[PDB]
Amino acid sequence: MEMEKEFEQIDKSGSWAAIYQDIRHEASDFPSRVAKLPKNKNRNRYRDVSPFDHSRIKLHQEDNDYINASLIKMEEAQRSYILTQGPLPNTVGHFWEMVWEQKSRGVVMLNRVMEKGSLKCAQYWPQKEEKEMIFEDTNLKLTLISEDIKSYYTVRQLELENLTTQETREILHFHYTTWPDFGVPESPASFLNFLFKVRESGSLSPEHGPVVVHCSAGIGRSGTFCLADTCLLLMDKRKDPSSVDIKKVLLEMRKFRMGLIQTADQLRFSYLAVIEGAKFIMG
């Protein structure tokens, strides 16, 4: 079926939970043996969210190459993404090592450091220009260059220096700051505006390594971001945009990382975002 009318048909019939459970039943199951080794317990935020072995990002280190991060490669859309958990106190250096090694231009953050009164990820970037951060375990230095605070999101320019080679690179930090503590946003308008700002920066384009996207677990809000982006790109590329099937795209993405889209409300919100976004691309 088309999307917008499949949408109204699920709303009128109140069957979002049944649709979402079908997706969960059909999703791929692949091994995640490296994630579950005992030496990696303090590298995982949640015991039930792990990268598959076949798609995990490897750190260029001979001691321990593990990080909770997955490469999502979308062949028809010609887009790639790295989805990862919010960094932990003992993985902030690994996080920036990955950004460096994979040649990423942008980092997309969809959570606040504290939500619901608890810490959802480490304070992994510097908050003042004159107070830089040094990660001694991976030999990297990170400096805040500028910050632009808007009503729904903040954009930061950062400098990452590889202290071994003295090479430097500019990284863009796109921080969506207004996702509610419970539920999903009422309108997709500010999320779409944010997606378009990431696109306009070059961070999603083939001349750079894959964008790094995270929330707390790296599957829920993060899944919504890449699902919406890929669906809108396919609608631009194809002769028949109504042929784009969001449930099929989500199942393809779940071949590369488990659990993408965590609730039926997040599924409905993804439909809403793609529907409204398709009108702005042209309406």
Ligand SMILES: N#Cc1ccc(O)cc1F
């Ligand atoms: N990209 C892409 C893509 C194309 C067709 C499909 O059924 C699912 C997909 F993710």
